[PDB]
Amino acid sequence: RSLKKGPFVDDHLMKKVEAAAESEKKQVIKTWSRRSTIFPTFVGQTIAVYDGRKHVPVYVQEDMVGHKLGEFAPTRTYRGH
Amino acid sequence: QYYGTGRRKSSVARVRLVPGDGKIVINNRDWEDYIPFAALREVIKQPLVATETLGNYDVLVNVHGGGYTGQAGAIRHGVARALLQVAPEYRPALKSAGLLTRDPRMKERKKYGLKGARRAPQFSKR
Amino acid sequence: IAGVDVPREKRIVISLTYIYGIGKQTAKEVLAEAGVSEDTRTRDLTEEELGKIREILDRIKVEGDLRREVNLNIKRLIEIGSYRGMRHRRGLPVRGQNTKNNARTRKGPSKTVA
Amino acid sequence: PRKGPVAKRDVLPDPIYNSKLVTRLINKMMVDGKRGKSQAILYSAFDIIAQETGKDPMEVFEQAMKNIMPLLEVKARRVGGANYQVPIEVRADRRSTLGLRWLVNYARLRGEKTMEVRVAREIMDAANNTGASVKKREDTHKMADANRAFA
Amino acid sequence: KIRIRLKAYDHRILDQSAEKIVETAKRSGASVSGPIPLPTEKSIYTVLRAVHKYKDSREQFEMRTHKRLIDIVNPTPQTVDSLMRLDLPSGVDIEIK
Amino acid sequence: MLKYNIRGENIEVTEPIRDYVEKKIDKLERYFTETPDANVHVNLKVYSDKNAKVEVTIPLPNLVLRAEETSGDLYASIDLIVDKLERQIRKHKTKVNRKF
Amino acid sequence: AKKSMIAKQKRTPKYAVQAYTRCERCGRPHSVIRKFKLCRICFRELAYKGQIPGVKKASW
RNA sequence: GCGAAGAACCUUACCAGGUCUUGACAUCCUUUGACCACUCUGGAGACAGAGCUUUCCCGGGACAAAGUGACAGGUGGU
RNA sequence: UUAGUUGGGCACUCUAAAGUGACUGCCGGUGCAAGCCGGAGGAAGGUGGGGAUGACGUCAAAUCAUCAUGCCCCUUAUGACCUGGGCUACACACGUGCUACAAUGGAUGGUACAAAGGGUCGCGAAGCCGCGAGGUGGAGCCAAUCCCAUAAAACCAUUCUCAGUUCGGAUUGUAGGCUGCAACUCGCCUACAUGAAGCCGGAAUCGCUAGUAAUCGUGGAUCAGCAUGCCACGGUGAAUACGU
Ligand SMILES: [Mg+2]
Ligand SMILES: [Mg+2]
Ligand SMILES: [Mg+2]
Ligand SMILES: [Mg+2]
Ligand SMILES: [Mg+2]
Ligand SMILES: [Mg+2]
Ligand SMILES: [Mg+2]
Ligand SMILES: [Mg+2]
Ligand SMILES: [Mg+2]
Ligand SMILES: [Mg+2]
Ligand SMILES: [Mg+2]
Ligand SMILES: [Mg+2]
Ligand SMILES: [Mg+2]
Ligand SMILES: [Mg+2]
Ligand SMILES: [Mg+2]
Ligand SMILES: [Mg+2]
Ligand SMILES: [Mg+2]
Ligand SMILES: [Mg+2]
Ligand SMILES: [Mg+2]
Ligand SMILES: [Mg+2]
Ligand SMILES: [Mg+2]
Ligand SMILES: [Mg+2]
Ligand SMILES: [Mg+2]
Ligand SMILES: [Mg+2]
Ligand SMILES: [Mg+2]
Ligand SMILES: [Mg+2]
Ligand SMILES: [Mg+2]
Ligand SMILES: [Mg+2]
Ligand SMILES: [Mg+2]
Ligand SMILES: [Mg+2]
Ligand SMILES: [Mg+2]
Ligand SMILES: [Mg+2]
Ligand SMILES: [Mg+2]
Ligand SMILES: [Mg+2]
Ligand SMILES: [Mg+2]
Ligand SMILES: [Mg+2]
Ligand SMILES: [Mg+2]
Ligand SMILES: [Mg+2]
Ligand SMILES: [Mg+2]
Ligand SMILES: [Mg+2]
Ligand SMILES: [Mg+2]
Ligand SMILES: [Zn+2]
Numbered sequence A: 001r002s003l004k005k006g007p008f009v010d011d012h013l014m015k016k017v018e019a020a021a022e023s024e025k026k027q028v029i030k031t032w033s034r035r036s037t038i039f040p041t042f043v044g045q046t047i048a049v050y051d052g053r054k055h056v057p058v059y060v061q062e063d064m065v066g067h068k069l070g071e072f073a074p075t076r077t078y079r080g081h
Numbered sequence B: 001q002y003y004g005t006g007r008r009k010s011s012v013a014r015v016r017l018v019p020g021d022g023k024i025v026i027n028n029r030d031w032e033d034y035i036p037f038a039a040l041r042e043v044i045k046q047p048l049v050a051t052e053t054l055g056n057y058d059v060l061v062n063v064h065g066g067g068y069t070g071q072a073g074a075i076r077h078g079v080a081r082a083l084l085q086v087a088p089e090y091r092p093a094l095k096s097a098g099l100l101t102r103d104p105r106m107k108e109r110k111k112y113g114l115k116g117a118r119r120a121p122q123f124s125k126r
Numbered sequence C: 001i002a003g004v005d006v007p008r009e010k011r012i013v014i015s016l017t018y019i020y021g022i023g024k025q026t027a028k029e030v031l032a033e034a035g036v037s038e039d040t041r042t043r044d045l046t047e048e049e050l051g052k053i054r055e056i057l058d059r060i061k062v063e064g065d066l067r068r069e070v071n072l073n074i075k076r077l078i079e080i081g082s083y084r085g086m087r088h089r090r091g092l093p094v095r096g097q098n099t100k101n102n103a104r105t106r107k108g109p110s111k112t113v114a
Numbered sequence D: 001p002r003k004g005p006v007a008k009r010d011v012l013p014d015p016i017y018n019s020k021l022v023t024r025l026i027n028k029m030m031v032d033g034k035r036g037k038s039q040a041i042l043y044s045a046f047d048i049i050a051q052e053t054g055k056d057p058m059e060v061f062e063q064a065m066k067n068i069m070p071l072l073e074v075k076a077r078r079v080g081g082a083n084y085q086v087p088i089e090v091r092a093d094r095r096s097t098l099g100l101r102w103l104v105n106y107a108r109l110r111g112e113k114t115m116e117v118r119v120a121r122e123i124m125d126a127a128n129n130t131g132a133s134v135k136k137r138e139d140t141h142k143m144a145d146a147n148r149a150f151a
Numbered sequence E: 001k002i003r004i005r006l007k008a009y010d011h012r013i014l015d016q017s018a019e020k021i022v023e024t025a026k027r028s029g030a031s032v033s034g035p036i037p038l039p040t041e042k043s044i045y046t047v048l049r050a051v052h053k054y055k056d057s058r059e060q061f062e063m064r065t066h067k068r069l070i071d072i073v074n075p076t077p078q079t080v081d082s083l084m085r086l087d088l089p090s091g092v093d094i095e096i097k
Numbered sequence F: 001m002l003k004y005n006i007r008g009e010n011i012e013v014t015e016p017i018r019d020y021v022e023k024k025i026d027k028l029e030r031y032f033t034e035t036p037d038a039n040v041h042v043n044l045k046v047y048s049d050k051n052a053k054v055e056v057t058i059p060l061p062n063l064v065l066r067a068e069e070t071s072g073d074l075y076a077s078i079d080l081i082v083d084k085l086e087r088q089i090r091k092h093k094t095k096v097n098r099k100f
Numbered sequence G: 001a002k003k004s005m006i007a008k009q010k011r012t013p014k015y016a017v018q019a020y021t022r023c024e025r026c027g028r029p030h031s032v033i034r035k036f037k038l039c040r041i042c043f044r045e046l047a048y049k050g051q052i053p054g055v056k057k058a059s060w
Numbered sequence H: 001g002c003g004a005a006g007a008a009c010c011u012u013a014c015c016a017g018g019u020c021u022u023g024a025c026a027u028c029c030u031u032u033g034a035c036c037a038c039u040c041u042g043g044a045g046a047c048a049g050a051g052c053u054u055u056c057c058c059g060g061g062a063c064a065a066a067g068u069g070a071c072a073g074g075u076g077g078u
Numbered sequence I: 001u002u003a004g005u006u007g008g009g010c011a012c013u014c015u016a017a018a019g020u021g022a023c024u025g026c027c028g029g030u031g032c033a034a035g036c037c038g039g040a041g042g043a044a045g046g047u048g049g050g051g052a053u054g055a056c057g058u059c060a061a062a063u064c065a066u067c068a069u070g071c072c073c074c075u076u077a078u079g080a081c082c083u084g085g086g087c088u089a090c091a092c093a094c095g096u097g098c099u100a101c102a103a104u105g106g107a108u109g110g111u112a113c114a115a116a117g118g119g120u121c122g123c124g125a126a127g128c129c130g131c132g133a134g135g136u137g138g139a140g141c142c143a144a145u146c147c148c149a150u151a152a153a154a155c156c157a158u159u160c161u162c163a164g165u166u167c168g169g170a171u172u173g174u175a176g177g178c179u180g181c182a183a184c185u186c187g188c189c190u191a192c193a194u195g196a197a198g199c200c201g202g203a204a205u206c207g208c209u210a211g212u213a214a215u216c217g218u219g220g221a222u223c224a225g226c227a228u229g230c231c232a233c234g235g236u237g238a239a240u241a242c243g244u
Helices: A011-019 B042-049 B068-086 B091-096 C014-017 C024-033 C047-059 C065-080 C081-088 D023-031 D037-055 D057-065 D092-107 D120-124 D133-146 E011-026 E077-085 F015-031 F076-096 G005-010 G045-047
Strands: A029-031 A046-049 A055-059 B002-008 B009-019 B024-026 B056-063 D072-075 D086-089 E002-008 E031-033 E036-047 E057-069 E070-074 E092-096 F003-009 F038-045 F052-059 F066-073 G055-057
Touching: A011 A029, A011 C014, B002 B068, B009 B068, B042 B068, B056 B068, B068 B091, C014 C024, C024 C047, C047 F066, C065 C081, D023 D037, D023 D057, D023 D092, D037 D057, D037 D120, D057 D092, D072 D133, D092 D120, D092 D133, D120 D133, E002 E011, E011 E031, E011 E070, E011 E077, E011 E092, E077 G045, F015 F038, F015 F076, F052 F076, F066 F076
Parallel strands: A029 A046, B024 B056, F003 F038
Antiparallel strands: A046 A055, B002 B009, B009 B056, D072 D086, E002 E057, E002 E070, E002 E092, E031 E070, E036 E057, E057 G055, F038 F052, F052 F066
């Protein structure tokens, strides 16, 4: 939602990140929701994101907030011609 | 107060001739305002020029359709036909000058497979 | 003269747009707000007029630090490790357009044939 | 083309100046069907010509055209050799065609300011055998007279 | 005080019933205004001719609709029920006011 | 320089096939002082009875070379197609020289 | 996978934006007119037989 | 600028992971006969676990299920 | 009357049914006939202009993927479902197009003239808000009634002064709008800023015979949203054809 109605995050991922609020922090969150935007609540956690064939890990840092998860999980493999 | 009807392209003009001075009025507007450009004015006068009847009638016209040039031709045809309407004697001069024939030229249909009415797409031989 | 040199024979509305951060519309705003007419040659400007112009211009972003601000934006989005950052590294169209043909004002002139 | 000669399209004489060649000149400076632009840039030219010179504009136009229309012209064809540039007499109609074509193909390139002037001082130059179009006619005449045997 | 609109895909079938209405109306003493031919509406459908290839070859079909209009200004109940119980051939559309 | 567009229907284009086509068609450059830049086009098909068909098209500056040939083997079809192409070359050259 | 596709298309999808249209005689998904709910082939072959009212060949 | 008169998901026929087996789709036999819906929990979703009904309609029909079988099913090939 | 608005009239345009009208018909010459050239009358003269119409057959031309079918093949999978990706990759090469390279122009303000189409799970006006894309609102409309929709070139004024620029717009940074459960790979649009190549394009090559070429806009099918593509409509509107 790129309007002023509000941000967008899938509830089946928001539930996981806010239930991972404990100090344990040893629950790497696996997800397929590439389209979910990154909230400030995500800070600290570590999320594996599906990029088509595997779950690649991303570490949600401070300046990564606001973007979409799928940005950090490339889906094409390019090396050179 | 004698009628006449002129058509050209997609434009229709209803002309009517009254005896009088010669002031020219188009669609409740003056002939110098509605058609401003100087040389787009001699087209209407030619039917009144091929015979020396320049200041013998005032025209009242109601025109619609087409662009500024096309309705000039329509109103030309209309005023000529009205001139024949007033006097059944002026036919030889105008028919001689070819000022009665309606223009049978109309914009042409488009055609499928062609970029216009006759333009064909580019083709290569190298 | 006003942060950087400007042409002399051109009108000030056309001369102020030689600064990295001023264009056709914000120059009009500066000239209208200050009071000078947009049809006065800059060589005909009084000292008080240019004096008034200078701080109005310096309040809003200036040609100097805008370079570093936009460059640090690019550096932030390229150090994060995003798709746009990878494009900025490799030098390819950042906005989502095709690259089989017509990516030339980025990739440069048509390189040597393979 | 292949069946037989085809009738031309008569040009209705222009208003104001009441001539034939003036309308055919207006039709040549036309671009993209813009009649008004050509009309204005020709009437401005024939007015400033009177302002500068003091003569009737049409007289200057005629006495400048009479120097540009060529007579002989080289045609590459058979008869007298396989494309040996046989010089031939241009027909009566072809004269004004070439004259206007050369008058306009060079008034586009004089290059000082708006063409509304570039066409005027080319008519003045043609009025006394100078410029570029007159040079074109002289060059064509020289080349035609070079092949005085292939006729 | 009633207005009748008749529309159909064929003018030949249409106008027979269009007139049938005006005679069946004015025979029972009705002041009726004759049919007024409204503009027809024609639409074009261009479809590729081949099955797989050849976009340059097509075929075009059309569907055109004709319309009429009838007015009665001073009716009587006999005209009303005569028009209402009169039945038209299928192929026309009648919209009695 | 010659640019080859090679298409293979009901077959896969294999590197030795490409090299053979390249060299055989490149032997066509000897008929000109200046080597052209035209796009050579080649099509290869194989039927069910082991018969192979090869089609070749070359748009020269003022000449169009077309040649199709079917035979029991693909390589033989290539060789015969080269012979056909050089035949068109000689025909055109003799005609244009005669029309001097 | 053809006969399953028609069955899926007639079902109700998860969200409205996933709905789409196919021809009704044949199951062709591309180039289907919503006036007739027919493709461009079941329209040509079947307007010739005079089975679509009103529609005839155009010559204007 | 051809099938495509319009690929974010669907389209989609391709790939990765998770799943099903008379089946997503039809005739056909046994019986319950309305299954269906809908609410919540778990999961990325397909799907599982519960709760509410099932007034089927008028022995026939519409549909369903349960196992049940002959069978379907292929945008696979020329 | 805010004005075709209101009462009033179908006179004129207009819509669309039935007819007339063009047939070498007449005249002059020619030929012997078919016919040819010239003229008359006419809105139109020599199949008036344009469509639809595509013979026997050639290329084993194209489509088993629109549909149908012979034979073969897979049948706990070559059948079926779900989420995420891909068809949008990028050292390069070829084809079709759009926009420019400026003064017949750029920018600002004033103002006039169309044809053909679409609209009830639809078109959506006035009014207010916002620089702008747009938001709020709900008038009229199953439409010759209401809406999309006060066409743009053109015309009249002012300014710029031949520069890689007050030409050109790519590329990029920031902030927003709409549709959609969802806009990162992968949508369209807007505002500020940035400001690239490009100064009429080698060999070669394409289109067009009159309302045509050129140029400027408008509508529709597909469609929640997305066209410089496709199919239609009009406005201004030329040059040349000696000849095979
Ligand atoms: Mg055609
Ligand atoms: Mg053609
Ligand atoms: Mg600059
Ligand atoms: Mg700007
Ligand atoms: Mg794109
Ligand atoms: Mg390209
Ligand atoms: Mg095409
Ligand atoms: Mg068609
Ligand atoms: Mg094939
Ligand atoms: Mg050999
Ligand atoms: Mg099937
Ligand atoms: Mg679905
Ligand atoms: Mg859709
Ligand atoms: Mg579809
Ligand atoms: Mg899928
Ligand atoms: Mg349950
Ligand atoms: Mg239950
Ligand atoms: Mg079977
Ligand atoms: Mg009215
Ligand atoms: Mg005779
Ligand atoms: Mg005659
Ligand atoms: Mg004809
Ligand atoms: Mg026939
Ligand atoms: Mg072939
Ligand atoms: Mg099959
Ligand atoms: Mg298994
Ligand atoms: Mg594609
Ligand atoms: Mg600009
Ligand atoms: Mg303006
Ligand atoms: Mg209309
Ligand atoms: Mg609409
Ligand atoms: Mg629409
Ligand atoms: Mg309402
Ligand atoms: Mg619109
Ligand atoms: Mg100047
Ligand atoms: Mg984006
Ligand atoms: Mg340069
Ligand atoms: Mg320059
Ligand atoms: Mg022709
Ligand atoms: Mg002709
Ligand atoms: Mg749309
Ligand atoms: Zn179909």
